[PDB]
Amino acid sequence: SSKAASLHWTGERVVSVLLLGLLPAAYLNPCSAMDYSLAAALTLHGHWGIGQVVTDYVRGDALQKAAKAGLLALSAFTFAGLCYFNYHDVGICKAVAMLWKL
Amino acid sequence: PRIKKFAIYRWDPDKTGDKPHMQTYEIDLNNCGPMVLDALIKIKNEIDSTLTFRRSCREGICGSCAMNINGGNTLACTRRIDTNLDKVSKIYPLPHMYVIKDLVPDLSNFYAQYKSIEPYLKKKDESQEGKQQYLQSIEEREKLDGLYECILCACCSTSCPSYWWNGDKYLGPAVLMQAYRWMIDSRDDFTEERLAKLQDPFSLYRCHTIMNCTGTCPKGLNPGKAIAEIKKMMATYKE
Amino acid sequence: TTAKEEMERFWNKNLGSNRPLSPHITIYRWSLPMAMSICHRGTGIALSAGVSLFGLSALLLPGNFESHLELVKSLCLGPTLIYTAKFGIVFPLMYHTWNGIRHLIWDLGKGLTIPQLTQSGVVVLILTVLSSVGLAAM
Amino acid sequence: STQYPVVDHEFDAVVVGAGGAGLRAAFGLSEAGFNTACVTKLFPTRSHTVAAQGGINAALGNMEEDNWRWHFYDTVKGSDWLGDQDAIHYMTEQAPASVVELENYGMPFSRTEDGKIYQRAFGGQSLKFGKGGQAHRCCCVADRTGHSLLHTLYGRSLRYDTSYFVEYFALDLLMENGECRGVIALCIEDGSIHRIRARNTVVATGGYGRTYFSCTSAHTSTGDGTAMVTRAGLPCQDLEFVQFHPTGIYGAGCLITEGCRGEGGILINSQGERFMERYAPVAKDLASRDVVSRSMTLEIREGRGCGPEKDHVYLQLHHLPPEQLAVRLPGISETAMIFAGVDVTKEPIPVLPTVHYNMGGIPTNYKGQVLRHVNGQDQVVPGLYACGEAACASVHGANRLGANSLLDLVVFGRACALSIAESCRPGDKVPSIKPNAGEESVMNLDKLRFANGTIRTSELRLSMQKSMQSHAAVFRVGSVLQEGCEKILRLYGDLQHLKTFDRGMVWNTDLVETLELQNLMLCALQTIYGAEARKESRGAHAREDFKERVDEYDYSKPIQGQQKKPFQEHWRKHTLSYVDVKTGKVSLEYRPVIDKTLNEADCATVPPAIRSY
Numbered sequence A: 001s002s003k004a005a006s007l008h009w010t011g012e013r014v015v016s017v018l019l020l021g022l023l024p025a026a027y028l029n030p031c032s033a034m035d036y037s038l039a040a041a042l043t044l045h046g047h048w049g050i051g052q053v054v055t056d057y058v059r060g061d062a063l064q065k066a067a068k069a070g071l072l073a074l075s076a077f078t079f080a081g082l083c084y085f086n087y088h089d090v091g092i093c094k095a096v097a098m099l100w101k102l
Numbered sequence B: 001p002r003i004k005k006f007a008i009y010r011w012d013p014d015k016t017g018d019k020p021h022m023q024t025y026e027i028d029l030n031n032c033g034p035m036v037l038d039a040l041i042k043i044k045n046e047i048d049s050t051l052t053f054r055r056s057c058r059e060g061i062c063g064s065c066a067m068n069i070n071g072g073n074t075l076a077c078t079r080r081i082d083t084n085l086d087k088v089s090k091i092y093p094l095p096h097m098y099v100i101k102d103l104v105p106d107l108s109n110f111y112a113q114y115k116s117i118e119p120y121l122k123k124k125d126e127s128q129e130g131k132q133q134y135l136q137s138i139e140e141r142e143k144l145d146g147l148y149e150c151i152l153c154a155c156c157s158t159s160c161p162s163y164w165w166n167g168d169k170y171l172g173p174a175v176l177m178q179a180y181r182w183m184i185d186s187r188d189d190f191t192e193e194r195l196a197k198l199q200d201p202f203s204l205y206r207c208h209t210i211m212n213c214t215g216t217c218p219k220g221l222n223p224g225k226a227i228a229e230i231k232k233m234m235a236t237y238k239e
Numbered sequence C: 001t002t003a004k005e006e007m008e009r010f011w012n013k014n015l016g017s018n019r020p021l022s023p024h025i026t027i028y029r030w031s032l033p034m035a036m037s038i039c040h041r042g043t044g045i046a047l048s049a050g051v052s053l054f055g056l057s058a059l060l061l062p063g064n065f066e067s068h069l070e071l072v073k074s075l076c077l078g079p080t081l082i083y084t085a086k087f088g089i090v091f092p093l094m095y096h097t098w099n100g101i102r103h104l105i106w107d108l109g110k111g112l113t114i115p116q117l118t119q120s121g122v123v124v125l126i127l128t129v130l131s132s133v134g135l136a137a138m
Numbered sequence D: 001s002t003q004y005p006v007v008d009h010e011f012d013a014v015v016v017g018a019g020g021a022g023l024r025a026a027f028g029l030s031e032a033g034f035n036t037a038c039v040t041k042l043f044p045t046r047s048h049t050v051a052a053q054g055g056i057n058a059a060l061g062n063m064e065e066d067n068w069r070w071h072f073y074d075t076v077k078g079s080d081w082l083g084d085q086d087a088i089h090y091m092t093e094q095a096p097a098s099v100v101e102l103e104n105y106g107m108p109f110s111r112t113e114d115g116k117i118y119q120r121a122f123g124g125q126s127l128k129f130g131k132g133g134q135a136h137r138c139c140c141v142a143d144r145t146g147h148s149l150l151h152t153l154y155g156r157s158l159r160y161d162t163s164y165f166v167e168y169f170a171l172d173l174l175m176e177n178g179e180c181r182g183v184i185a186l187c188i189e190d191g192s193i194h195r196i197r198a199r200n201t202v203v204a205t206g207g208y209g210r211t212y213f214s215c216t217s218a219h220t221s222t223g224d225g226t227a228m229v230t231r232a233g234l235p236c237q238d239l240e241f242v243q244f245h246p247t248g249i250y251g252a253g254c255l256i257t258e259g260c261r262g263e264g265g266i267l268i269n270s271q272g273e274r275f276m277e278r279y280a281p282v283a284k285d286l287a288s289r290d291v292v293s294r295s296m297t298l299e300i301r302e303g304r305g306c307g308p309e310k311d312h313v314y315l316q317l318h319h320l321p322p323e324q325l326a327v328r329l330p331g332i333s334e335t336a337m338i339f340a341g342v343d344v345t346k347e348p349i350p351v352l353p354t355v356h357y358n359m360g361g362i363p364t365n366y367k368g369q370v371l372r373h374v375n376g377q378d379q380v381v382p383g384l385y386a387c388g389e390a391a392c393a394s395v396h397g398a399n400r401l402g403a404n405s406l407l408d409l410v411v412f413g414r415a416c417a418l419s420i421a422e423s424c425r426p427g428d429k430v431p432s433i434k435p436n437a438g439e440e441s442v443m444n445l446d447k448l449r450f451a452n453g454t455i456r457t458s459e460l461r462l463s464m465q466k467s468m469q470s471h472a473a474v475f476r477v478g479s480v481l482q483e484g485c486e487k488i489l490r491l492y493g494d495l496q497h498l499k500t501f502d503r504g505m506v507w508n509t510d511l512v513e514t515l516e517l518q519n520l521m522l523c524a525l526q527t528i529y530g531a532e533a534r535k536e537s538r539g540a541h542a543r544e545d546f547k548e549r550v551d552e553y554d555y556s557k558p559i560q561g562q563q564k565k566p567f568q569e570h571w572r573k574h575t576l577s578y579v580d581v582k583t584g585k586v587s588l589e590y591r592p593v594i595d596k597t598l599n600e601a602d603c604a605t606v607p608p609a610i611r612s613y
């Protein structure tokens, strides 16, 4: 047995309990180290989220390849863009803090 | 007199490109049975003998009369006629299924999926069969309860939205429940490879716990709970 | 004949025929578990659109975050307008968060009965309203 | 001509019917190595074996120590000595072997502390040849035995290269000079006609319960294979013997199992008395089905009815523990609130004697071979077999023993497979059929497809169903039966003034049910005429004018100083029924009952005696 689809399902639930744990953790500790791990969790869970949406509505064998590649491209730009924001700007924790008291 | 209105889905494949249209039938409820099937039989026997439908046991234990009544997929011999005379009972076939005639769906794919899981006892050694009964305790026997009762009415699978869009590659609640039915069976030895047959994104993992399957089951069974229980076995089985 | 052959012969008889598909979404009864599943997918996509739009703007659009807030500050700061706009952020966020837990509870194999679905379905719905109104006043 | 497309299929064996006996015969032939085709008008699961709730009889010996030879005695005594004892020998001997066979297939039998199959008490079963008291040999899957039987038979059938003609209505047998060559059948999906030719043909179409108004049987139990043998000119056996199940709902006619009486359910009349102890002292309420239902219908005669209009009796489950009703009888518990609006734990079930079983059917050898009657002797019809309720190897005789039909299915279904496997080999010459064979079968179909008369199919059906219920009930007198005979004959002459509405090819339910009507009528004629001719009270057939049980000897007194009655004087013989299709003329003759067993040393022949529980 080569459980590829089984291990993928577990990973989705692993990042879910992680993302559920990180949101209050970011409120308690809004450090730079939290910013990158939150940017990693937001993108990965979101990528595997739309991945399930694509495999549901897209008919496949022709558009399936294009949609999965188009999503991977978007997810790569999202994670890099967020990492750029954490390094060259205030960070996603400080971004919310300033936005919410506006 | 006590008049009850029935609006039924009708399509004739012999009327040269006929459109699927609804047809209203009026029935004296005082001179009819309590169940929907009794009413469907009544219009067939009295009003119009053109309404085609599957019926057999009239008892609720064969799964022939399975159809969509008022937006719910149940057996017509189990669901009783709505006593409220001011409402018209909308009668449709099973959702997102190929219509052969009036309320008659093509279930060939449904049964084929049930064949693809291998619903029979598989032993590693078969040389000692048909001579001695296999042992099972009352404790191990109770684990099959609520699973073997499935009558294959195809109500739960046809209610599932995932089975609508992905009916070709996704097996559906009814079939998956039977796959689980042969998994926990203490007699069966091929438990590992039954799970290994579901190692693709479509066979099992197209379920998203929408939970329309349990909510419509005529026998009150819980396929969704059984599906989620498979998912737990899939992530824990070794080798 | 085999199971795989039965499926292959099924589609050839139906796709090349005059047989129509039975009505599905037009006729089926609206369930609370069904509607809440659609909203979970709706909020899922809406949130992923926001997260991606935020990271994508950090690369494409010029200027830092401090200057970007000033554009929002430029327009009249309506107390009843900012609160409503801020409410429309946490509303799809907290619904998906509370219902996300409900999905994770289901993955443990617990609370999968019809009465339990309707109970936990309301609890998630109520927690959303409270957490959305509560966080908008932070 | 040129209207219908004929598609000829070539196989080794054709099994008409996909029920219990049908599947066992079907998959067993491919398991033996034959190219087997299975023809069925319904999907195999929708078959009426699922409705079976009681159980399946086997002397395995799990509750107490048991012997299959006692199960032989209980069946032959139950058969009122009309049952062929060679067939009962074969059924009871490999009864434990064929049930273990099913459990090994995957059947989730109810269990005990030992871990073995749960057996229970049932109507008319006794240990130590009747003297030992109550017996427990009814193997059950918690009140859903027949449903679980069919699923584990169907499930196991996918292991083999069996062809399945799902939803194909069989019209007539393919016959050439007395020899059976296969089946001509109608496809329901598109409307075409298929000729399926094979060296051997098995018929497992079940009973004809739809002949009556009130029955526990399905809407499809129309004795199609029984009336298929009829049009071929071959006889039908014991068709007047119709079993009335004592416990059936007053409403839709649904079945409440005899397993209710086997667990501890008692029958109580409107007076409040335990009336079943009054009629039968030994077995009481758990007696044979020809005695219990006889007592219930007699309660109406003295006006002791429980119902609002005083017509039905009660089955009490008020005293039964709710712990047992959830584990041992869940199937009848849920269906009680549906059709009656009654919970089993606080109030009794409204029950009434209703049509249940047809022991009489197609004359059958203990091997499974279909028997024709020529010159007072039995002849085997070449390439024709029958198993199940449609068959009559007469293992049930005049009255079927409780929970014996599911056994009759698996054992004789297996026997039909073995008798083919040991006679001819797979791949042997398939006898060529005539180019225009089954011409009248197609011409028949074309008449009712374009039927333009005055009387509707369903209106003639109701006229048949209600006439049988009043004239051929539990009790029937010669004057009442004779009126019914000439009444059914008049209804047969109306089968040319029939009115149909549907004129399509794809799924014509208005046409197939009228074909069922042709089959039902031919079964009804032979049932009523065979009943009026029989001048005795034996088993389910009870004559009010002839209360006597007429045998070759007066078996009440010792057998020695008594001369034997001639064959055409006594009534301990099988009723063989022929009927001309064109005029509806019923002609009857009789063949001797088989008394000899397969081995006298291994199993003793039980002579006729006074029958009462």
Ligand SMILES: *Cc1cc2c(cc1C)nc1c(=O)[nH]c(=O)nc-1n2C[C@H](O)[C@H](O)[C@H](O)COP(=O)(O)OP(=O)(O)OC[C@H]1O[C@@H](n2cnc3c(N)ncnc32)[C@H](O)[C@@H]1O
Binding pocket: D016, D017, D018, D019, D020, D021, D022, D039, D040, D041, D042, D043, D044, D046, D047, D048, D049, D050, D051, D052, D053, D054, D055, D056, D145, D146, D168, D169, D170, D171, D204, D205, D206, D207, D216, D217, D218, D221, D224, D225, D255, D257, D356, D387, D388, D389, D390, D402, D403, D404, D405, D406, D407, D409
């Ligand atoms: C009626 C009944 C019988 C019954 C019972 C409960 C009820 C309500 N409970 C039982 C029990 O608890 N224990 C037991 O031992 N027996 C019980 N019975 C009796 C027994 O179950 C029946 O006799 C049994 O169902 C008979 O089985 P069989 O396989 O011989 O017949 P069937 O199940 O009715 O299946 C018939 C099949 O034949 C096909 N068919 C019929 N006509 C055609 C034509 N026209 N063309 C093609 N195919 C045809 C049907 O498709 C069906 O599958």
Ligand code: HEM
Binding pocket: A016, A017, A019, A020, A021, A023, A042, A043, A045, A046, A048, A049, A050, A052, A053, B208, B209, C040, C041, C044, C045, C047, C048, C051, C096, C097, C100, C101, C103, C104
């Ligand atoms: C921390 C709170 C969150 C939790 C507990 C959570 C959990 C989950 C779970 C368990 C699922 C799978 C549901 C199913 O079985 O179908 C899911 C779906 C999804 N989530 Fe999240 N999630 C959270 C936050 C987010 C965020 C912030 C995003 C935005 C990037 C997101 C995007 C998605 C998407 C696109 C799906 C797919 C929709 C679906 O298939 O139903 N989630 N979530």
Ligand SMILES: CC(C)Oc1cccc(NC(=O)c2ccccc2C(F)(F)F)c1
Binding pocket: A056, B161, B162, B163, B165, B206, B208, B210, C024, C025, C026, C028, C037, C038, C041
């Ligand atoms: C009767 C209507 C409301 O019915 C519909 C219509 C459209 C979409 C849906 N709901 C989904 O489609 C859905 C929702 C959540 C998760 C997975 C799905 C999936 F898998 F794709 F089936 C239901």
Ligand code: SF4
Binding pocket: B149, B150, B151, B152, B153, B154, B155, B156, B157, B173, B174, B177, B213, B216, B217, B218, B219, B220, B221, B223
């Ligand atoms: S699981 Fe329930 S709804 Fe689904 S086919 Fe079986 S009985 Fe019908």
Ligand code: F3S
Binding pocket: B159, B160, B161, B162, B163, B172, B173, B206, B207, B208, B209, B210, B211, B212, B213, B214, B223, B224, B225, B227
């Ligand atoms: S409805 Fe469908 S997605 Fe689910 S839990 Fe049932 S299989």
Ligand code: FES
Binding pocket: B037, B054, B055, B056, B057, B058, B059, B060, B061, B062, B063, B064, B065, B066, B075, B076, B077, B078
């Ligand atoms: S007809 Fe058998 S389930 Fe309704």
